[PDB]
């Protein structure tokens, strides 16, 4: 049997819980493979110790979902000590980090694409709902709930949702922006504060970098009887799709957990076996990276998801 060590940055991350379960399902098809699954409990120091333990247990590959993206180098040097391949997933290392070790790979997404798609969804809905322009100034007065600072998805989704709106001719005014660290409760509390402050009446649209934060905002809006304000997310979690159906969420963007899990597993297994990373698969690896497309979702195409 081939042992592959896997770390998930925290099992209670909504999206990574989906990915974790998918990778375990994929491991069923490989009777020759054993995954050693680790919850890093949102602590890079805990993850680092877990990786040491995995390497001591003789794993032939690592699949690592970092707590801290900047810690890729640290993790690479651990893997290098055993000359073990490492497939990073979902939190993208720098190009320099990936190039520092020939056995380091990455599976994830084109982060900017999710921001562009989200911006196009907002543009569509804004044009179709001019009642959303509460102050009739032709600009979107928005608040934005950001993911972890420095996380490539948080940075790209935040930059590109606004860039895309602006590029499409829709001016925007940032009323508030803060991180809620990908978390529902923090997002709910932050949105509630914004709704309880002076100038809460100016808020026209809520933009969240993910669905779990969007869901927290939905709950805060409900508490204030402000559900007329639209909310947009990213991931297309099942719970989020149910809120698209009910009208509580205006739109989201599928982050394809199933294919990211499958690519991570396939590459890790090949690398563990000493084969080419993409051998026997149709994955297109571009300079050691696989990116899986995002797809926008709203009521108009929900039936497809
Ligand atoms: O790294 C974890 C984060 O990954 C992102 O791609 C997802 O959209 C977030 O929901 C998740 O919290
Ligand atoms: Ca306005």
Q: What is the 3-state secondary structure (H, E, C) of 144-205?
A: EEECCCCCHHHHHHHHHHHHHHHHCCCCEEEEEEEECCCCHHHHHHHHHHHHHCCCHHHCCE
Among protein residues, the one whose CA lies closest to atom 11 of ligand 1: 15
Local structure of 103: helix, strand or coil: coil
Cα–Cα distance between 179 and 95 in angstroms, integer? 25
Cα–Cα distance between 303 and 305 in angstroms, integer? 6
153, 209, 211, 256: residue to mutate for ligand 1 pocket, most atoms within 8 A of CB = 153
3-state secondary structure 269-280: HHHHCCCCCCCC
- Residue 66: nearest ligand to its CA? 1
Q: Is the CB of 255 under 6 A from ligand 1?
A: yes
Q: Is the CB of 234 under 6 A from ligand 1?
A: yes
Q: Is the CB of 84 under 6 A from ligand 1?
A: no
Domain 110-255+294-305 in CATH 3.40.50.2300: yes
User: What DSSP state is assigned to residue 76?
Assistant: H
**Largest Cα–Cα separation, the chain:** 65
Q: 264: closest CA among 105, 120, 29?
A: 105
Local structure of 213: helix, strand or coil: helix
Are 209 and 235 in contact by the 8 Å Cβ rule? The answer is no
Local structure of 2: helix, strand or coil: strand
Q: 157: closest CA among 94, 218, 107, 110?
A: 110
Cα–Cα distance between 77 and 31 in angstroms, integer? 30
CA atoms within 13 A on the CB side of 305: 25
Cα–Cα distance between 234 and 214 in angstroms, integer? 8
Say if strands 104-108 and 140-146 run parallel, antiparallel, or are unpaired: unpaired
Numbered residues of the known binding site for Ca(2+):
133, 135, 137, 139, 141, 204
Q: Is the CB of 141 under 6 A from ligand 1?
A: no
Cα–Cα distance between 298 and 2 in angstroms, integer? 42
Give the resolution value in Å: 1.1
Cα–Cα distance between 220 and 229 in angstroms, integer? 11
- H-assigned helices in the chain: 14-28, 44-56, 72-81, 95-99, 111-128, 152-167, 184-196, 211-223, 238-246, 257-272
The conformational region for residue 150 under phi > 0 = left, psi -120 to 50 = alpha, else beta, is: left
Cα–Cα distance between 148 and 154 in angstroms, integer? 6
Cα–Cα distance between 217 and 219 in angstroms, integer? 5
Q: Which residues contact 305 (CB under 8 A, 6 or more apart)?
A: 236, 241, 254, 297
Cα–Cα distance between 64 and 48 in angstroms, integer? 10
Cα–Cα distance between 64 and 106 in angstroms, integer? 9
Q: 54: closest CA among 68, 73, 69, 34?
A: 34
Say if strands 252-254 and 295-297 run parallel, antiparallel, or are unpaired: antiparallel
Q: 291: closest CA among 27, 92, 8?
A: 92
Kindly tell me the burial class for residue 82, based on how many C-beta atoms sit within 10 Å of its own C-beta (0-12, 13-18, 19 or more): middle
Q: Give first-to-last CA distance, the chain, whole Å.
A: 37
Cα–Cα distance between 76 and 86 in angstroms, integer? 7
Give CA separation, 217 vs 84, 201, 214, 228, 296, in Å. 42, 16, 5, 12, 20
Residue 117: CB atoms within 10 Å: 24
> Is the dihedral angle over the CA atoms 109, 112, 116, 122 positive or is it negative?
positive
Residue 58: CB atoms within 10 Å: 10
Q: Which residues pair with 63 in a beta bridge?
A: 6, 87
CATH number of 1-109+256-293: 3.40.50.2300
- Residue intervals of the chain classified under CATH 3.40.50.2300 are 1-109+256-293, 110-255+294-305
Are 164 and 131 in contact by the 8 Å Cβ rule? The answer is no
Cα–Cα distance between 249 and 184 in angstroms, integer? 14
CA atoms within 13 A on the CB side of 186: 15
Minimum-distance ligand 1 atom for the alpha carbon of 114: 8
Q: Is the CB of 112 under 6 A from ligand 1?
A: no
Local structure of 226: helix, strand or coil: coil
Determine the distance separating the centroid of ligand 1 and the alpha carbon of 17, expressed in angstroms: 10
Cα–Cα distance between 168 and 161 in angstroms, integer? 11
Cα–Cα distance between 294 and 40 in angstroms, integer? 26
Q: 90: closest CA among 33, 13, 30?
A: 13
């Amino acid at each position: 049997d081939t042992r592959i060590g896997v770390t998930i940055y925290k099992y209670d991350d909504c999206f990574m819980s989906v990915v974790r379960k998918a990778i375990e399902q994929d491991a069923k098809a490989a009777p020759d493979v054993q995954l050693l699954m680790n919850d890093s409990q949102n602590d890079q120091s805990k993850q680092n110790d877990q990786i040491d333990v995995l390497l001591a247990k003789g794993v032939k590959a690592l699949a690592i979902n970092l707590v801290d993206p900047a810690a890729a180098g640290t993790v690479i040097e651990k893997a290098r000590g055993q000359n073990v391949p490492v497939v990073f997933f979902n939190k993208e290392p720098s190009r320099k980090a990936l190039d520092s070790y020939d056995k380091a790979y990455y599976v994830g997404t084109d982060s900017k694409e999710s921001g562009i798609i989200q911006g196009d969804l907002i543009a569509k809905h804004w044009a179709a709902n001019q009642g959303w322009d509460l102050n009739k100034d032709g600009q979107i007065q928005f608040v934005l709930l950001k993911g972890e600072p420095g996380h490539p998805d948080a940075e790209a989704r935040t930059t590109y949702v606004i860039k895309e709106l602006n590029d499409k001719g829709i001016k925007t005014e940032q009323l508030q922006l803060d991180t809620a660290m990908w978390d529902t409760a923090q997002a709910k509390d932050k949105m509630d504060a914004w709704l309880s402050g002076p100038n809460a009446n100016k808020i026209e649209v809520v933009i969240a970098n993910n669905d779990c934060m969007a869901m927290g905002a939905v709950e805060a809006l409900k508490a204030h009887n402000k559900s007329s304000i639209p909310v947009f997310g990213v991931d297309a979690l099942p719970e989020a799709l149910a809120l698209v159906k009910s009208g509580a969420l205006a739109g989201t963007v599928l982050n394809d957990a199933n294919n990211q899990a499958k690519a991570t597993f396939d590459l890790a297994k090949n690398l563990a076996d000493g084969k080419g990373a993409a051998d026997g698969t149709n994955w297109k690896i571009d300079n050691k990276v696989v990116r899986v497309p995002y797809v926008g979702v709203d009521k108009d195409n929900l039936a497809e998801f």
